[PDB]
Amino acid sequence: LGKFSQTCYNSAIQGSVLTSTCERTNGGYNTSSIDLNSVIAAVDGSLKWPSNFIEACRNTQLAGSSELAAECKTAAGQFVSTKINLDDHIANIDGTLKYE
Amino acid sequence: LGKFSQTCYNSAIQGSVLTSTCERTNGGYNTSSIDLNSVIAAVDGSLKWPSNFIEACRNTQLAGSSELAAECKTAAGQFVSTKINLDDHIANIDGTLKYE
Ligand code: NA
Ligand code: NA
Ligand code: NA
Ligand code: NA
């Protein structure tokens, strides 16, 4: 996976955004950016790649009126029960669900 | 923050997606969805809210050709040095930077 740096140049980071100028298949280049804020996490002082839950969890369900429940895989490899209250961060903003 | 469930109904979870029918300011309702995959993480079997790095880190820089370096806050409250190789997951796809 990855390996952008091998065929890109003029790379820069500002805040959470990576910008680089990269080779196209046909020759020539294109400059683009990617905002990494939501794809890199800071965990106890260490930068980590994301741990999106669907890649580690099964049997997602709504529990009650606001809880997301699932069975998720531990580092040891077993699935354990877990839940999280969606009311912590999901808001009704004038009729539309939004994260805050 | 959050609290959608207080003024929404007919909520459902399928996979990583929450769907609900929520009250608008003017009365009446709107049905919407939100894909939580990238806003909820699975960490060692436990669902957690995101830890986007910019909310915990300072002095982001490009180190060399492909590393993101920063100083990030530990649970204890001190900033420590950390880095992550963007080549792990950022690809040049025909001239455009993409996460994979
Ligand atoms: Na690829
Ligand atoms: Na499943
Ligand atoms: Na709000
Ligand atoms: Na800063």
- Partners of residue A35 in chain B, C-beta under 8 Å: none
Could you list the residue range(s) of the whole structural domain that residue B61 is in? 1-100
Comparing alpha-carbon positions, the chain B residue that sits nearest to A33 is: B97
- Across the interface, of B7, B72, B96, the residue whose CB is closest to A92 is B7
Show the beta-strand stretches assigned E in B2-78. 8-14, 17-23, 29-35, 41-43, 46-48, 57-63, 67-73
Q: How far is CA A44 from the centre of its chain?
A: 17
Count: domains in chain A: 1
**DSSP-assigned states of every residue in A16-29:** TEEEEEEE-TTSSE
What is the structure's resolution, reported in angstroms to one decimal?
Answer: 1.3
d(CA B23, CA B65) in angstroms, rounded, equals 49
d(CA A21, CA A35) in angstroms, rounded, equals 15
d(CA B34, CA B48) in angstroms, rounded, equals 17
Q: Which amino acid is at A32?
A: S
Residue (of B83, B97, B42) closest to A73 by Cα position: B42
Q: What is the CATH number of the domain that holds B32?
A: 2.30.60.10
And the tokens for B90?
């950022």
Q: Is the dihedral of CA B45, B50, B51, B53 positive or negative?
A: positive
The CA–CA distances, whole Å, from B56 to A42, A61, B52, B60, B74 equal: 6, 31, 8, 11, 8
- Chain A segment 56-85 residues within 8 A of B by beta carbon are 56-57, 60-62, 65-66, 68, 70, 72-75, 78-80, 82-84
